């Protein structure tokens, strides 16, 4: 992105225009799994694409819920519903309940 200074010239290769595609019949597995997150206020469920990482969902509650992000984590049966694993990969199979805590 920017880093502190950059004394690197042009690389050997050169990525240019190609068939990146993106607007031509392209689904994304809308298996929106339901995730019930408990916060210090009430119980609110969230919708997320079955193929999403916690890093994205983690920033979702911070902006919408307005509380935290780094320390913000979810306690699923003792485990840590966080970036360490994938919410759709174990934290939520199709509607699970987890406690929210900021450590």
Going from N- to C-terminal start, the domains of the chain cover 1-103
Give the length of the chain.
Answer: 103
3-state helix, strand, coil in the chain (%, to 5): 15, 25, 60
Helix (H, G, I), strand (E, B) or coil at 43: strand
Experimental method: NMR
Nearest alpha carbon to residue 52 among 78, 64, 73, 34: 34
**Domain covering 1-103 in this structure, CATH number:** 3.10.20.90
Q: CA distances (Å), 80 to each of 51, 72, 87, in order?
A: 18, 10, 10
């Amino acid at each position: 992105m920017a880093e502190n200074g950059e004394s690197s010239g042009p690389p050997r290769p050169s990525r240019g225009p190609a068939a990146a595609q993106g607007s031509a019949a392209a689904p994304a597995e809308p298996k929106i799994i339901k995730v019930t997150v408990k916060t210090p206020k009430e119980k609110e469920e969230f919708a997320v694409p079955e193929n999403s990482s916690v890093q994205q969902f983690k920033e979702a509650i911070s902006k919408r819920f307005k509380s935290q992000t780094d320390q913000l984590v979810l306690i699923f049966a003792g485990k840590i519903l966080k970036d360490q694993d994938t919410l759709i990969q174990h934290g939520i199979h199709d509607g699970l309940t987890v406690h929210l805590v900021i450590k």
